[PDB]
Structure 1
Amino acid sequence: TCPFYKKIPGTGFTVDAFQYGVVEGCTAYFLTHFHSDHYAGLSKHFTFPVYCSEITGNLLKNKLHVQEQYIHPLPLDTECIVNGVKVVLLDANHCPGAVMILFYLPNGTVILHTGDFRADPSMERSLLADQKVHMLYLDTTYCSPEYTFPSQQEVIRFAINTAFEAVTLNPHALVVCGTYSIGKEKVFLAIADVLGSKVGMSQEKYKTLQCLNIPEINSLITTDMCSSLVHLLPMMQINFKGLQSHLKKCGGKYNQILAFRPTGWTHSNKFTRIADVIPQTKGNISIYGIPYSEHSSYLEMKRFVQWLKPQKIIPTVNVGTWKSRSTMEKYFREWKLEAGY
């Protein structure tokens, strides 16, 4: 059944709740972003109102074939009324089109649902600064102190420098980047930019990217693999067998692959700096796992919450085990006692 952490009290609303059938008493289904664990259930047969960003609505129409009459896109940073209730969509610093949602309940309660987010100090100057938030529905993906990772900027500088060095030393090397969802487009676009190439990809993935309102996108991507020396493949193909196979397909245009797997966290983070990352190599194939995250680190999450000072926190991730739930509740209490709220 629909879990309580997907329901907004005092409303008929749910958030990211499309796989439970008809949720009894739901008048408006919000979707924070286009990742499959969150949209699971949607299709052309859905006939209730879906509220979302413009970009998420482009993906619902073009990729899932949801009918236009049920897609209700909202502008960001704008007070809107939905079924009698004031709401605002905010940028979540996750993937393209991902939002946080502010609900202003008729009784005076203010609720923030983060969806999935990567907390940032820039959020402290949005419309969130303007009133008190009483309840926070929080993306707790990496809510434990072991989870450190570098800035996105540091990670992209490493990737750009590594790729440019490799291809200038060997003009017959191919660069491959893995993907299995939207998000992390800076990785492949920044490397193609430094090399003077477009990124080549499948027709399915090109269609997906053309829904994202990215500026000058027609100048950066292509379905012509032969004219490109940065290729995108399914994340599943980023291994030695998958890559050897792909190299056969390029007909001796290339004699070396340098591949990137943008993971979330990996336990080489509790020891190793970004400067010190090394690839796994077999023959003429090298694979780099780079810690490019679109979720908050522990310290980023803690700063956001200690700034916001909510009265009550409802985790939305890692909620399935008692040990995880109890650990998270202990951190929430530490933060509140340290900051004095």
Structure 2
Amino acid sequence: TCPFYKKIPGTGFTVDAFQYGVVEGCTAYFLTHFHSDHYAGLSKHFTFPVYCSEITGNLLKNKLHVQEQYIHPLPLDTECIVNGVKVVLLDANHCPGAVMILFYLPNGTVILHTGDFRADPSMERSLLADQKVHMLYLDTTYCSPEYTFPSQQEVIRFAINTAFEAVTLNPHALVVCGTYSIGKEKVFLAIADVLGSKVGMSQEKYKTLQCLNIPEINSLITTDMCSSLVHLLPMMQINFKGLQSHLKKCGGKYNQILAFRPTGWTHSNKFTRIADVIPQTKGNISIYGIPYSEHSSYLEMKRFVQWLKPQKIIPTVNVGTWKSRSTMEKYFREWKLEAGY
């Protein structure tokens, strides 16, 4: 059955709760963003109201084939009424169309659900600053002090300079960027822009990108692989074997590959700065691991929560084991004692 952390008290609302069949009591199903763990169970066969951003709605319609009558897109940063309750959707700084939701309960309680997010100081001057938040449903993906990473901008700058140098040294090199879902689009779009190229990709991936309300998208992406010097491939193909194979497929138009695997955290975050990063190399193919994160680091999460000062925290990630929950509760108490709430 639907866990308590996906229910919003004093409403018949749920969030990211599509895998449990019909939820008893539920009159409106919110979807924070289009990642398969969160949407799991939604399909053309779902017949209840789904509330979401416009971008998430485009994806639901076109990729999952959910019928249009059941999709209720809402604009950002706007007070809206859903089934008699005031809500606001905010940018989560995660992947395209990802939202946090603010719920104003009839009794006067205020609840923030972060969905998946990457906490940032610009969220300190949104509609959140205007009133007290009593309860916080928190993306606790990286809630442990070992999880540090550079800013998105440091990582993009590194990627840009690396790619520009390699292709100026060898104008017959191909750049490849690995991908599995939506998110991290800036990696491949910034590389292409410094090289004066469009990004080439499969038909399914192109269809996905065409839903995302990215300005000038038609000038940036194509399905003609031939005509482009940055290609997207599935993450699973980003290895020496898959990359040599792809290079045979392109018809001797390129004689070298430089490939980027955007990952989350891995253990080498604990020593190496972004400037020290060096690739793995086998012959005429080089692979760079770059920690481009769309989740809060420990320090970013801590700052956001210390600012917000919620009366209660409800974790939404890593809640499946008692050890993880116990560990997280310890960090929440520390933050509360340091900050005086």
Query: If the length of structure 1 is used for normalisation, what is the TM-score?
Result: 0.99
**C-alpha separation between the residues in 2 aligned to 1:81 and 1:253?**
56
**C-alpha separation between the residues in 2 aligned to 1:143 and 1:338?**
17
Q: CA deviation at 1:251?
A: 1.1
Instruction: Could you tell me which runs of 5 or more consecutive residues in structure 2 were left unpaired when the two chains were aligned.
Output: none
Q: CA deviation at 1:322?
A: 1.3
**C-alpha separation between the residues in 1 aligned to 2:120 and 2:259?**
29
2:60 — aligned with what?
Answer: 60
Q: CA deviation at 1:278?
A: 1.0
Q: CA deviation at 1:323?
A: 1.3
Alignment of 1:1-341 (within 5 A): 1-341=1-341
1:156-207 CA distances to partner (integer Å, 9 max, x unpaired)?
Answer: 0000000000000011110000000000000000000000110000000000
**C-alpha separation between the residues in 2 aligned to 1:238 and 1:4?**
39
**C-alpha separation between the residues in 2 aligned to 1:261 and 1:70?**
37
**C-alpha separation between the residues in 1 aligned to 2:313 and 2:108?**
18
**C-alpha separation between the residues in 1 aligned to 2:309 and 2:195?**
45
Q: CA deviation at 1:321?
A: 1.3
**C-alpha separation between the residues in 1 aligned to 2:216 and 2:146?**
39
1:139-158 CA distances to partner (integer Å, 9 max, x unpaired)?
Answer: 00000000000000000000
**C-alpha separation between the residues in 2 aligned to 1:3 and 1:166?**
50
Instruction: Could you tell me which runs of 5 or more consecutive residues in structure 1 were left unpaired when the two chains were aligned.
Output: none
Q: CA deviation at 1:317?
A: 0.4
1:85-110 CA distances to partner (integer Å, 9 max, x unpaired)?
Answer: 10000000000000000000111110
**C-alpha separation between the residues in 1 aligned to 2:134 and 2:291?**
33
1:100-134 CA distances to partner (integer Å, 9 max, x unpaired)?
Answer: 00000111110000000000000000000000000
1:28-87 CA distances to partner (integer Å, 9 max, x unpaired)?
Answer: 000000000000111111110000000000000000011111000000001111011100
1:245-291 CA distances to partner (integer Å, 9 max, x unpaired)?
Answer: 10000111111100000001111101100000111111111110100
1:196-242 CA distances to partner (integer Å, 9 max, x unpaired)?
Answer: 11000000000000000000000100000000010000011101111
**C-alpha separation between the residues in 2 aligned to 1:158 and 1:185?**
15
Q: CA deviation at 1:2?
A: 1.1
**C-alpha separation between the residues in 2 aligned to 1:107 and 1:270?**
46
**C-alpha separation between the residues in 2 aligned to 1:279 and 1:325?**
37
* SS class of match (2:267): coil
**C-alpha separation between the residues in 2 aligned to 1:165 and 1:265?**
26
Identity %: 100
* SS class of match (1:192): helix
**C-alpha separation between the residues in 2 aligned to 1:283 and 1:20?**
49
**C-alpha separation between the residues in 2 aligned to 1:260 and 1:285?**
11
**C-alpha separation between the residues in 2 aligned to 1:323 and 1:279?**
36
**C-alpha separation between the residues in 1 aligned to 2:325 and 2:170?**
50
* SS class of match (2:293): coil
Q: CA deviation at 1:3?
A: 1.1
**C-alpha separation between the residues in 2 aligned to 1:321 and 1:20?**
20
**C-alpha separation between the residues in 2 aligned to 1:91 and 1:208?**
20
* SS class of match (1:112): strand
Query: If the length of structure 2 is used for normalisation, what is the TM-score?
Result: 0.99
RMSD over equivalenced CA pairs, Å: 0.5
* SS class of match (1:63): helix
**C-alpha separation between the residues in 1 aligned to 2:277 and 2:319?**
32
**C-alpha separation between the residues in 1 aligned to 2:74 and 2:128?**
18
